[PDB]
Amino acid sequence: KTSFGSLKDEDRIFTNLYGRHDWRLKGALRRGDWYKTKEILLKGPDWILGEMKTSGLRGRGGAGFPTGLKWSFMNKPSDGRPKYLVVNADEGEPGTCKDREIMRHDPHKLVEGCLVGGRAMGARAAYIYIRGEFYNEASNLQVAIREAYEAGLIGKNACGSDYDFDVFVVRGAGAYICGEETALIESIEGKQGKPRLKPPFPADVGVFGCPTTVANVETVAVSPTICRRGGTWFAGFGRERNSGTKLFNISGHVNHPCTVEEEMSVPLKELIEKHAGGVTGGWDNLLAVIPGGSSTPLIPKSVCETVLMDFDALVQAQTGLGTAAVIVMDRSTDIVKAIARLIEFYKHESCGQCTPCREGVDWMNKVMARFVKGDARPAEIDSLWEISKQIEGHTICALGDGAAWPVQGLIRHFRPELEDRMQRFAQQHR
Amino acid sequence: GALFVHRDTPENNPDTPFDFTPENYKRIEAIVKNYPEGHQAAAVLPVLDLAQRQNGWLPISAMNKVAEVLQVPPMRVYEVATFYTMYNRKPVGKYHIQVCTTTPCMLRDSDSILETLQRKLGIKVGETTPDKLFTLIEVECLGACVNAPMVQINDNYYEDLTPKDIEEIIDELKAGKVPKPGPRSGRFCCEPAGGLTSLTEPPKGPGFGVQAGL
Amino acid sequence: SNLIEVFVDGQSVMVEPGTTVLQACEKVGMQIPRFCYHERLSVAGNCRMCLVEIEKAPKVVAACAMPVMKGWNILTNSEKSKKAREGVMEFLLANHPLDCPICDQGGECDLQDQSMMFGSDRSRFLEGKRAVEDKNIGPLVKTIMTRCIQCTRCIRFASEIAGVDDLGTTGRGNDMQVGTYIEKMFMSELSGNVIDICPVGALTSKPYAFTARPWETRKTESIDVMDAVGSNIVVSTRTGEVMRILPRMHEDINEEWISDKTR
Amino acid sequence: SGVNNTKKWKMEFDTRERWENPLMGWASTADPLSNMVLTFSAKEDAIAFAEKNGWSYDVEEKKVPKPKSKSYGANFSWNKRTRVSTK
Amino acid sequence: TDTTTYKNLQHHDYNTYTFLDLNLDLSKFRLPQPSSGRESPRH
Ligand SMILES: Cc1cc2nc3c(=O)[nH]c(=O)nc-3n(C[C@H](O)[C@H](O)[C@H](O)COP(=O)(O)O)c2cc1C
Ligand code: SF4
Ligand code: SF4
Ligand code: SF4
Ligand code: FES
Ligand code: FES
Ligand code: NA
């Protein structure tokens, strides 16, 4: 099929997204969670790892690697070390709020996917690293983790299966980089959130030096349903190799900014116009949209008139789905002063470990501040462009990558605005 | 702004008295049992956060005490406390007002929310009111972008503000009342204000759509 | 009988499994640029000066950490490798201070010398520089930390060779600073060796400061008698006068270190 | 860290007295061979040159750095002392 | 069937030690942690 949208309310995984119905154990049961789990655990890992493979699920954290293949690196005989699952609730990228709702309104789907996903990987426990600012969501999660322990759903002999499993909530201390998979692993270890190099890959040397898998909240929180409702059912949504539903955040200059769940590959215009109520001042007032959090390049109105919302449609437009966080800007915005803020954010978030992001991201920040003020020369635009190509691809982790793409996106599509401010500054101060 | 070198002063030195209360020692014993034996060093963050929650900031004596309890080099605790922004190494007010200014909030007049808090409290970002009651600073995306603008006071979120609304929260705090966490525009969470557009039907109960043969 | 075969610019090398790209190039005689890596410290991998192109791969691997895989062609001098070095050297120097005339490293600075061999000849950095306040860590090692390139060699040496876990990094991002946070003296019978392993003038010798330049000095390869270990040393002299004692490498005795008494 | 001054063999002469010039304090010498430094490609070429010239020589064997086992992944060992406590 | 109010309100009463008290109750249900085999890497 070629249409994608108006997802039926029967096919929505996060049936309690808005927190209207009860989130505690007595309610998550009435909505299907923890149902026939003992049947799922006894089916083995090769069946669960076959469900994730078939569904074409790709990690929702922001890199989009196939979830089934990735979780199979931990499907190996043990060498005497414990195996661990680390759910990434760091929720750090600007524009994205999806993971917040799962931990606050549907925590029993997150605890269940930790068991289901952990069983597939042969893990003994799950560490749920949540960002330190989400103190109330963490408490919700701890209250639900207690209830699933009291009822026997996790812990010793979970769901009467034979498997023993633990769920630990570890609270972060306020750093966007600890959401990086290997920085996260180091933070759980009592160190600074500095990412590691690869290899070794966490599937060999991970948390505490043990084999580890890091999964996003939204990635794990849908593993139980995919096992319950089948691989093919989740493959029925979205284009080939872009399967499933998705949590879309729409923010910025929309009428009704909101978090909604929608099918994958829905056209960006439909996503804004239906669920968000449209751009402020009309669609024609649209200037540019960041299709997935501040890391991804922006795109102008022309490319937003037909582009879909999935990992491949947005890659032909020179951007990415990222976290599927949609930030909209209308003509009254100061586009250059808005991207220059993303650089201040990446400049303020860089761990400082490796040279290109240490100096480059800060250096790009200093330059972008002058473009905003207008105090530069049109020959610096190609200089800044190049300085970004020396950050991208040379850093330990992908933050320097994500700090370079926004600058590339602005230069690609909004150069005349950069070169028209610089005129007004020269004349004004001649 | 802030400095990552500590110089002793009469009100912050290795002899400023800090100790864990006996009911915050039973809590530490439970933090340290979350990690494999031999890797107790993984407990530095929660325990170093525990000291802050019991004192509101981290004197150099507090940090030297987490080190003694967990048996790590003190420098390894100094690295942690200086790395993460939530550890207050300089004393702060009773209420720590954090205003988000990253792009999603900036597009919704987060400056106005900031401009208002400056005049109402009579301070500037980074300062602390002479009452030692309020501390105002900007921050980065606090994860509630769809409900911008928003502030965090201590451990709560006050979303969807309008310059009028934040003023209300600064008086309930002066009056000693608790200003009720949550949005401020009628809607309760992240749903689209103006009625729902999704999840209208009642949820679909247990056993729905379950594949055959399971 | 497990020596895999790798290629360095085409020439084939039989290396043990576990050898890195950087050690593979040692054997064909090619030395990779570096700052953070040191053969006697744990691998760190943050300076990114060793980025090297592997044929048919798009990204560049860190030569000092990437384990080598059989059938690889390491292109130590391709365009990607040369451009990674130029870009990286360009960042290292962006916030570095114009200190070479007043710096005790000048004339024997890995940052000066690798900027001449692998970096560019221009500056396109038109901003202000950072400046970090100095730390007083004892009477032997002078710190002028604006010259630090945050390579963490001092941190790894102190931790793993001296066993003195007192140097570390505080702060974060471009504000990240090496040191001790508090005011501690880095006193140890092996502490003077940070002067050698620090690749720049951030950590230099107080007793030796300002007294000579490297090109001036004559090197006499002698032995140390302050103890019975017989550490191999080098004695720099200038115009009939002893300037400083340095370690001479001897694997079976002192490796590359000497006690502070010797130094 | 460069190793490019460690490839060739050198021939140097024993140090002789230097003293201070009475007028200026410069370093005076009566040794004509104090700044003589011959370069050779092989240990054998350097010995032959000294032999045919009658200089008594003294040879020291090349000190190469022994090959070492590196491993970034060793910094995170589940149970070995090589687990570093800081990056 | 309600779905017209907000049924996540318990967080209006969490205090400064909530997360750390639940973690203390949960300590009875945990399983014996694995042991590397040494007290620490010996800092
Ligand atoms: C700077 C940075 C921040 C990241 N933050 C997050 C995050 O807050 N949540 C997340 O699920 N992934 C985040 N990621 C991506 C993770 O590294 C990784 O892709 C993800 O945890 C893998 O889990 P997945 O299978 O669901 O994709 C981040 C990456 C970078 C470079
Ligand atoms: S790219 Fe930035 S955040 Fe990532 S490791 Fe390097 S310095 Fe740290
Ligand atoms: S360390 Fe000293 S000599 Fe080397 S580049 Fe810096 S200022 Fe110049
Ligand atoms: S002081 Fe020297 S050795 Fe230490 S991190 Fe800085 S440049 Fe490297
Ligand atoms: S940008 Fe302010 S909460 Fe995300
Ligand atoms: S020498 Fe390899 S990154 Fe520094
Ligand atoms: Na030095």
Descriptive account of the structure:
Chain A: [4Fe-4S] cluster binds at residues 351, 354, 357, 397. Chain A: It is found in: Mitochondrion inner membrane. Chain A: One of its GO terms (cellular component) is respiratory chain complex I. The structure is cut from a larger assembly and holds chains A (430 residues), B (214 residues), C (263 residues), D (87 residues) and E (43 residues). Chain A has 430 residues and is an alpha/beta fold. Chain A contains 18 helices and nine strands. In chain A, the strands form two sheets. A five-stranded mixed sheet of chain A has the order 6-5-9-7-8, with helices on both faces. Chain A starts with 24 loop residues before the first helix and ends with a helix. Chain B has 214 residues and is α+β, with helices and mostly antiparallel strands. Chain B has helices at 26-31, 44-53, 60-70, 74-83, 103-106, 110-121, 163-174; strands at residues 95-100, 134-139, 150-153, 156-159. Chain B has a four-stranded mixed sheet with strand order 2-1-3-4, covered by helices on one side. In chain B, helix 2 packs across helix 3 and helix 3 crosses helix 4. The longest helix of chain B is centred in the middle third of the chain and has 12 residues, at 110-121. Chain D has 87 residues and is α+β, with helices and mostly antiparallel strands. Helices cover 13% and strands 16% of the residues of chain D. A two-stranded antiparallel ribbon of chain D has the order 1-4. In chain D, strand 2 and strand 3 (27-29) form a beta hairpin. In chain D, 11% of the residues are buried. Classes of the chains: A alpha/beta (430), B alpha+beta (214), C alpha+beta (263), D alpha+beta (87), E mainly alpha (43). Chains in contact: A-B, A-C, A-D, A-E, B-C, B-D, B-E, C-D, D-E. One iron/sulfur cluster is lined by residues 148-154, 178, 198-200, 202-203 of chain C.
Strand content of chain D: 15-25%
Q: Please give the number of β-strands of chain D.
A: 4
Give helix and strand order of chain E, one letter per element, not per position.
Answer: H
User: Helicity of chain D, in percent?
Assistant: 10-25%
Alpha-carbon distance between the two ends of chain E: 58 Å
Helical element count of chain E?
1
Protein name (chain B): NADH dehydrogenase [ubiquinone] flavoprotein 2, mitochondrial
Binding site for [2Fe-2S] cluster (chain B): 100, 105, 141, 145
Family (chain B): Belongs to the complex I 24 kDa subunit family.
Modified residues (Phosphotyrosine) (chain B): 158
List the helices and strands and how they pair.
This is part of a larger assembly, with chains A (430 residues), B (214 residues), C (263 residues), D (87 residues) and E (43 residues).
Chain B: H1 26-31, H2 44-53, H3 60-70, H4 74-83, E1 95-100, H5 103-106, H6 110-121, E2 134-139, E3 150-153, E4 156-159, H7 163-174
Parallel strand pairs in B: 1-2
Antiparallel strand pairs in B: 1-3, 3-4
Helix pairs in contact in B: 2-3, 3-4, 6-7
Chain D: E1 9-12, E2 18-20, E3 27-29, E4 37-40, H1 43-53
Antiparallel strand pairs in D: 1-4, 2-3
Chain E: H1 18-25
Bound molecules: flavin mononucleotide, iron/sulfur cluster (3 copies), FE2/S2 (inorganic) cluster (FES) (2 copies) and sodium ion.
One iron/sulfur cluster is lined by residues 148-154, 178, 198-200, 202-203 of chain C.
